[PDB]
């Protein structure tokens, strides 16, 4: 394009609004703030959760639970994704990482059982759900745990 006829995409840029420039624009004297309150003052307003003295909602309901230091989370792989592999292939967590369908392993690879598979495959992973194992041996493959 020529620099003397630049035209940005329509709808992608808009004009800023300026308040306090005369009464003809609708944002003149009071500048969209009303008349003589706390919210009409410079730097005015109350805290995010303030209710004017009434007890805040979070302070009239109880706390619950604790946090486990040894919490374990697993990367989830479903069966339908696993269909993208030529059968007779030994599927390995390192292979799952190299193909790019698993970005980071959190505490191990655990496969689930939604969707369908139809390929004879051998799969090894840290954990298996019951139905996922049943579906894998249903198609003829074998499951082994790492």
């Amino acid at each position: 394009m020529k620099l003397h006829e630049l035209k940005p995409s329509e709808g992608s840029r808009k004009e800023r609004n300026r308040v306090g420039r005369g009464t003809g624009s609708g944002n003149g004297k009071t500048s969209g703030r009303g008349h003589k309150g706390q919210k009409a003052r410079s730097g005015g307003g109350v805290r995010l959760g303030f209710e004017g003295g009434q007890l805040p909602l979070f302070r009239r309901i109880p706390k619950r639970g604790f946090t486990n230091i040894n919490r374990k989370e697993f990367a989830i792989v479903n069966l339908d994704v696993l269909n993208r592999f030529e059968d007779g292939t030994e599927v390995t967590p390192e292979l799952l990482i190299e193909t790019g369908i698993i970005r980071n392993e959190k505490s191990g690879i655990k496969i689930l059982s939604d969707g369908n598979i139809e390929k004879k495959l051998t799969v090894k992973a840290n954990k298996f759900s019951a139905a996922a194992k049943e579906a894998i041996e249903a198609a003829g493959g074998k499951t082994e745990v790492i």
Partner: protein
């Protein structure tokens, strides 16, 4: 595709260019956005004004609060005073921003193909000079009928082209890796050496 020609003006044969680079349908909106992005990151943004807390003086209340007949005043450097401080004004600040990589690659492809779509691109087999001489370069430019702002892309040898063309006004020489959207858009014609074409194609 295009017609390769020698630097003396005589035809040198034929040259073909990759269609994934020079043959795509240009995306104008992406080019405009990238041009704005590249132009907005060239500015220093060195500017500054003094608030009422940096103007020398102040502190003492000019006169009493009540009973004197004058208006209530609190400092000699208040914004409404004559020598007072600025309210908001400018401040040192950066303006640079950068947009996703694939967008920038699409932009360079589109603007580089748009030149070919308008017959504003010249490919020549070689371009060399024994010694730096602006007269020879001017004669060259006259021979290949450019007569306008031009950008010359030389790849590896070039002998001494930058020196022998540094004084001409609307002429710029870049080493085939510094190619940019804004630089290409700034100049009218684009003269590119054959050896630079392979480099440009293989990079993108």
């Amino acid at each position: 595709k295009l017609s390769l020609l020698k630097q003396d003006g005589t035809n040198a044969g034929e040259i073909t260019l990759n269609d994934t680079v020079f043959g795509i349908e240009p995306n104008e909106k992406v080019v405009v956005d990238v041009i704005l992005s590249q132009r907005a990151s060239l500015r220093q943004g060195t500017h500054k004004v003094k608030n009422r807390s940096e103007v020398r003086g102040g502190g003492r209340k000019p006169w009493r609060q009540k009973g004197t007949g004058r208006a209530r005043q609190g400092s000699i450097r208040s914004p409404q005073w004559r020598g007072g401080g600025v309210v908001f004004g400018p401040t040192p600040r950066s303006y640079a921003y950068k947009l996703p990589k694939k967008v920038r690659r699409l932009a360079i492809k589109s603007i580089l193909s748009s030149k070919v779509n308008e017959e504003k691109l010249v490919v020549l087999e070689g371009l060399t000079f024994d010694a730096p001489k602006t007269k020879e370069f001017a004669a060259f430019l006259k021979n290949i009928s450019v007569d306008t702002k031009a950008l010359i892309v030389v790849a590896g040898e070039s002998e001494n082209v930058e020196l022998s063309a540094r004084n001409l006004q609307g002429i710029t020489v870049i080493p085939a890796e510094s190619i940019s959207v804004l630089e290409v858009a700034k100049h009218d014609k684009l003269i590119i050496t054959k050896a630079a074409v392979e480099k440009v194609e293989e990079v993108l």
